[PDB]
């Protein structure tokens, strides 16, 4: 009977809430006189957050990433039949990347041909944005020598301050895992490597589970040993994909839809 079931549980929940509130009040009142008991109870009760329940080379860096000895030239292009949104995103790419050259897609020069031309021009990396609708959906980065590349999915693209001409400071967070630090190294070698702290410009990459948040802010310190920050325009989140490890050959970590069931391990 629906009425019986609804009535029985409705009263049960009220009594449970009353008991919970009374117990909490009594516990707080008794702990006020016994502060140590509160500490013991807190120690005996862990919040069991998802983060707390996670389920468990210099030659490589130089060889597969740019170094300060030579600034990296990054080749920027767009997938064929691109439209206004792609160029609008490329504008931000120019505004944020150090040394970019924009070339229209020639529609027939194979990836091998593009790589050969870039080698002829001494380019360092290739970045290409791809679109399906009038929106950016994915971004790719490839290094010329030895062809280490990464493919990133793009979501939640949102256009409040005006960035200055100063090079923002680079900060990376939560890249402890071996796979994560590879993307961290890619970002550290693709973005400018020469800070100009004067001007208080900062660029931050923050991964939490699998998505990395890229944002820009102005940071000003106060006497309270704390720093306030203000949004500097665009919002950006990316998802690593296909981990090719080559130009297109020998994929190493390519994601599959069958994953994410474990709810953990935060690749």
């Amino acid at each position: 009977n629906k009425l019986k079931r609804q009535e029985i549980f409705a009263d049960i929940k009220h009594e449970k809430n009353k008991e919970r509130h009374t117990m909490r009040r009594k516990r707080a009142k008794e702990e006020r006189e016994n502060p140590e008991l509160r500490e013991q109870r807190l120690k005996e009760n862990v919040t069991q957050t998802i983060e707390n329940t996670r389920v468990y080379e210099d030659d490589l860096m130089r060889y597969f990433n740019s170094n300060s000895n030579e600034p990296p030239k990054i080749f920027l292009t767009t997938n064929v039949n691109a439209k206004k949104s792609a160029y609008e995103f490329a504008n931000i790419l120019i505004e944020i990347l150090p040394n970019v050259t924009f070339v229209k897609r020639k529609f027939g020069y194979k990836l091998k041909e593009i790589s050969d031309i870039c080698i002829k021009r001494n380019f360092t990396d290739i970045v290409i944005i791809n679109e399906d609708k009038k929106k950016v959906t994915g971004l790719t980065f490839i290094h010329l020598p030895e062809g280490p590349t990464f493919y990133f999915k793009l979501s939640s693209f949102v256009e409040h301050g005006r960035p200055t001409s100063h090079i923002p400071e680079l900060i990376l967070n939560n890249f402890q895992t071996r796979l994560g630090q590879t993307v961290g190294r890619l970002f550290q070698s693709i973005l400018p490597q020469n800070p100009d702290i004067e001007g208080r410009q900062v660029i931050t990459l923050h991964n939490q589970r699998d998505y990395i948040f890229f944002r820009r802010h102005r940071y000003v310190f106060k006497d309270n040993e704390r720093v306030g920050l203000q949004e500097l325009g665009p919002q950006f989140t990316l998802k690593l994909k296909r981990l090719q490890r080559g130009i297109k050959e020998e994929t190493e970590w390519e994601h599959k839809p069958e994953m994410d069931k474990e709810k953990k391990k935060f690749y």
Partner: protein
């Protein structure tokens, strides 16, 4: 058991000592007894091929173009023991990148194509080994009375060369091939100073679209000579090869130059390679080098790996028997090799050393090495007390 793992990133040989059931991904799971690097030379001169002459002496080859003889020693360190490696002699300057560089143009897609050791196995008792390179240079190395390696000859094969396999089934002949290079049978003079091109493969007829079928045999394994009728003029050799385009081709010199049957293993011509003959029940039906000890293709079963993540199992008719490490291999398996018919060595870009059971496909050992894996060899299957 004891295993040696080649680490391309660190350019060192890693000795893995662990029992069956080892899993480094779980703290409570059995952990390897010892895993340390040996003879580190960096990613610039990483080991490319390895062959275990014996449990005390081994010969290693590096992508730098140098083959080094390694002396193995043991010292004690529960109650198990670990090995140490010392290099006694080496031969260098075997690579010639000019040939590969001249062939870089018109290739599907790749870099300058730096040369590398494709095969390294004894020619014969005589401590004579043949070294093959992607540039097509075939070098002969013999162990002298003083144990120092000496180069006897430097033969030349049609480049590019992707594989080389000797015909050890007496019942010296070997076959090689590469990108847009049909398989050619080569006979070696007893003095190793000359090579004769006895037979060459032929491409199959065009497909529905009339497009020429590309030729790119990645691996080859020989079978016993065809029994019964043996017409003269034609040779008597049986072998099968796996191409990048997923086409499983079986060759019979008695039948003719063209393969008698071609089977598409995967749709869309999925990149396939590493054709290793294996027994469905784990029997050692493969010769010392790996050739199948049979004269029929119906009993042939081969393990092949795609370039994305999977390790495929195929029979003699191209039927997929299943997958190995489907839910555990997250990356391309750069190296796969059947050991003793029952153990399947697995390694690649995932940085995890895996040992699978051919009988049941169960994952027996899982060891994390950090660096990428390109070659694995097992020294002993004994379990540490």
């Amino acid at each position: 058991m004891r295993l040696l793992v080649s680490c391309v990133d660190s350019g060192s040989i890693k000795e893995v000592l662990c029992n069956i059931g080892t899993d480094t991904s779980v703290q409570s799971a059995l952990q390897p007894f010892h895993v340390a690097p040996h003879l580190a030379e960096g990613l610039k001169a990483y080991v490319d091929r390895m062959w275990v002459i014996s449990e005390d002496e081994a010969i290693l080859a590096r992508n730098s173009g140098v083959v080094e003889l390694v002396k193995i020693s043991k010292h004690l360190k529960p109650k198990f023991d670990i090995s140490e490696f010392e290099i006694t002699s080496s031969v260098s300057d075997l690579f010639d990148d000019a040939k590969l560089e001249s062939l870089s143009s018109k290739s599907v897609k790749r870099t300058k194509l730096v040369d590398g050791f494709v095969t390294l196995c004894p020619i014969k008792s005589n401590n004579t080994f043949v070294a093959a390179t992607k540039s097509g240079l075939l070098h002969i190395i013999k162990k002298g009375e003083d144990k120092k390696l000496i180069k006897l000859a430097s033969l030349g094969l049609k480049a590019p060369v992707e594989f080389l396999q000797l015909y050890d089934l007496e019942d010296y002949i070997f076959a090689y091939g590469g990108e847009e290079n049909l398989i050619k049978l080569v006979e070696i003079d007893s003095s190793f100073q000359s090579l004769k091109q006895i037979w060459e493969a032929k491409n199959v007829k065009n497909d529905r679209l009339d497009m020429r079928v590309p030729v790119w045999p990645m691996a080859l394994r020989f079978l016993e000579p065809s029994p019964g009728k043996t017409e003269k003029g034609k040779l008597n050799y049986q072998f099968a090869a796996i191409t990048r385009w997923s086409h499983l081709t079986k060759y019979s010199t008695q039948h003719g130059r063209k393969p008698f049957a071609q089977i598409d293993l995967l749709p869309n011509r999925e990149p396939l390679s590493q054709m290793e003959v294996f027994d469905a029940k784990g029997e050692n039906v493969v010769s010392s080098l790996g050739n199948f000890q049979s004269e029929t293709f119906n009993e042939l079963n081969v393990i092949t790996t795609d370039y994305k993540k999977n390790v495929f199992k195929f029979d003699g008719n191209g039927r997929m028997l299943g997958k190995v490490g489907r839910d555990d291999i997250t990356g391309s398996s750069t190296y796969i090799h059947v050991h003793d018919g029952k153990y399947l060595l697995q390694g690649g870009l995932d940085r995890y050393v895996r040992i699978f059971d051919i009988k049941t496909n169960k994952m027996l050992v899982k060891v994390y090495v950090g660096s990428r894996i390109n070659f694995i060899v097992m020294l002993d299957d004994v379990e540490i007390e």
